Write an enzyme that holds these catalytic residues in place. Structure first.
Site, short mmCIF file in Angstrom:
data_model
loop_
_atom_site.label_atom_id
_atom_site.label_comp_id
_atom_site.label_asym_id
_atom_site.label_seq_id
_atom_site.Cartn_x
_atom_site.Cartn_y
_atom_site.Cartn_z
N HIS A 49 0.87 -1.16 0.00
CA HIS A 49 0.00 0.00 0.00
C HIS A 49 0.91 1.21 0.00
O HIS A 49 2.07 1.12 0.40
CB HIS A 49 -0.85 0.04 1.26
CG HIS A 49 -1.95 -0.97 1.28
ND1 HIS A 49 -2.93 -1.01 0.31
CD2 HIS A 49 -2.25 -1.96 2.16
CE1 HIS A 49 -3.77 -2.00 0.58
NE2 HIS A 49 -3.38 -2.58 1.70
N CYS B 233 -0.09 2.71 -4.33
CA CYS B 233 -0.83 3.96 -4.49
C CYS B 233 0.09 5.14 -4.16
O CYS B 233 1.02 5.00 -3.37
CB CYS B 233 -2.04 4.01 -3.56
SG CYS B 233 -3.13 2.57 -3.68
#
Lengths: 154, 141, 95, 94, 140, 153
Positions: free
Chosen positions: B87, B129
């Site tokens: 992430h 991300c």
């Protein structure tokens, strides 16, 4: 070259291939560019029967890799109870520190692996071992709120 | 005009495969990342890299591995590769326990800090991300 | 006797997405970027220069992926990766 | 039916990396532009854009070094920074 | 594998040449930038670009020019190029009167905002500081 | 026309002889480049007085506008070319032309403190109340730049 196929067979968990390669004289203690042995690779990927065949064929139970990790380090980290036991029965250094300040007990404490902690303690795991952050097995168990494990570590 | 490949080894490739995250971070499971790491392990091995994969690394463990990787002797390697799968947010990547600056990870490999990779390509592939913006796309009419 | 190298030289960062943006991942197949990268490398990894590869990766991610969701907010979105090069020569994986 | 990412097909050729100074000769012009024009004049119609910008990177990195009587500003180096969201090869061949 | 170059024109190239800055900014003169702009004018024209150069632009003027440039009809151009020569800081570039985000200038050219450049290369060459760090270099 | 193009480049570079030759040979005086700039635009901007004048005598559109609506007078006023400004005004350049950015010759001239240019523009009927994009007239601009002489006029 025979060692390379053995490293891969072990990583793979290709039991029959491992046995064949042993029969063909493959070096059980062959190591790759990161200093990992077939025992490292089998231990890490949960391949118990390969771990045992390797152990019975005189694999260095305490071989260290590029960052000083032993097969026991990797097994404790990944939660492989039977492998941890197999490693310990063959004289794995229960209190070995890798280059990152990890011990098997602290690895197992971190991820909440109760049974592994108990086996390590049974084999003389140092409950006072300090992780780089000065934290012991018990400290780690509280911070993760795992009270049952805190109880075991007393 | 071409990087010298006349070396004993193509080089080392370290992959950080972060799938599971501490409850405190509130981050979900990254399902499918295991396939990413395995396919990358095969591709990069096929190119000639010696590859290693570390799963579910804390921030500290990511920092230490990369620092340690920079302290290897790359004299006989043509280049170095690092793959991060996790992430992320702007400028930053998740360990299992929180966020760390991407620049802290790569810093160890700077010319003055990693002599044996000097004038050699240092490759970082980053699947994460970088914020919450969504690309709506546009049709070619 | 003298030539110095910039300490920041000879890095390449291949990001799956542009700054500020989401990066898409299929729970069953993996991330769009990695899927595409492995596909291109498998076919061309030993023939093309690194920038040729990553450009085809850009194209593959841009044209062949589009998000799917029952959440209208997340439905039919797109992605473009982002290559940052401070490389000073061409890079072929050749040996 | 096919959508294009709205962020696709840009290229940014920065004279320097994020956070850094970018050097300019008062008499000759900026390091980056000097190198860029030199490369384009010689190879602009023959090479792909990334080969061009890479040779620019190399030229700036190897052949320039700051000079100053201020020790703080003396003998410094520079590397430019190419950011590509391009989806095809770019030759200036029209 | 290649961008289509089969167009009437290679395309437009706009150069923003900022040399002199208002006293309020505290920024010095950028000597040598005129040579930069002239050399770039020649190179880019030689490649086939239609080049135009604007000197000492305020932030508002740079904004208007790039927006206006994006609103030109690029149907018969293969690509577009913009060159910015100025002082700078992280993520921003100086007009003569202050700083403006580089992203604001480039936003006008996004696929959904500039249709006649959709699927065509949009090129930005940026000569400006991006912060105050100095690369001391290292010897091999 | 290739000749229209050569005239554009000759005019920008200040090639006096080349300009006259192309004209005698039938080059379009009102040739246009991709940005809508004419030879007159390019000569006016770069201070080429004699080229400006030869173009003017050959019926160049004194009020031709480019892609952002700027006339040769806009460009001359901005760069401080006094004699070019006058030549343009004498050939009927629109003293009050607004470009697409809100600029007038007077306001351009006021900004850079070109006192003599301002005076000529005033003589030709320049609107002293014209406002730029930010509501400022030539007078407002003269104060903000501390030009006390220009403020007086």
């Amino acid at each position: 070259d025979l060692g390379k196929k053995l490293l891969e067979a072990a990583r793979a968990g290709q039991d029959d291939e491992v046995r064949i390669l042993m029969a063909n004289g493959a070096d059980v203690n062959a190591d790759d560019a990161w200093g990992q042995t077939p025992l490292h690779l089998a231990a890490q990927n949960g391949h118990l029967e390969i771990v045992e065949v390797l152990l019975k064929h005189d694999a260095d139970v305490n071989a260290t890799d590029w960052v000083g990790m032993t097969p026991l380090h990797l097994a404790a980290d990944d939660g492989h109870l039977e492998i941890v036991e197999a490693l310990l029965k063959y004289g794995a250094d229960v209190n070995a520190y890798d280059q990152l300040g990890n011990t098997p007990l602290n690895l197992a404490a971190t991820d909440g692996h109760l049974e592994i902690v108990e086996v390590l303690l049974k084999y003389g795991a140092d409950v006072n071992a300090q992780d780089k952050f000065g934290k012991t097995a018990f400290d780690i168990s509280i911070d993760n709120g795992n009270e049952d494990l805190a109880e075991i570590l007393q | 005009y071409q990087y010298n490949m006349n070396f004993e080894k193509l080089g080392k490739c370290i992959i950080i495969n972060n799938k599971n995250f501490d409850k405190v971070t509130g981050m979900g499971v990254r399902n499918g990342t295991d396939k990413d790491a395995e396919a990358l392990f095969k591709c990069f091995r096929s190119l000639g890299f010696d590859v290693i994969v570390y799963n579910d690394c804390s921030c500290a463990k990511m920092q230490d591995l990369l620092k340690k990787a920079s302290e290897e002797d790359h004299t006989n390697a043509a280049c170095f590769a690092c793959i991060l799968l996790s992430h992320g947010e702007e400028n930053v990547i998740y360990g299992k326990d929180g966020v760390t600056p991407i620049k802290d990870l790569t810093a160890h490999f700077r010319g003055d800090r990693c002599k044996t990779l000097l004038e050699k390509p240092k490759l970082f592939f980053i699947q994460a991300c970088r914020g919450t913006e969504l690309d709506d796309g546009i049709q070619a009419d | 006797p003298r030539y110095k190298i910039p300490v920041e030289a000879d890095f390449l960062f291949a990001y799956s997405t542009v700054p500020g943006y989401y990066s898409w991942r299929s729970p069953g197949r993996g991330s769009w970027f990695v899927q595409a990268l492995c596909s291109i490398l498998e076919e061309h990894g030993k023939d093309l220069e690194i920038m040729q590869i990553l450009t085809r990766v850009n194209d593959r991610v841009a044209r062949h992926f589009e998000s799917q969701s029952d959440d209208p907010h997340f439905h039919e979105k797109k992605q473009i990766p982002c290559v940052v090069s401070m490389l000073t020569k061409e890079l072929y994986f050749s040996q």
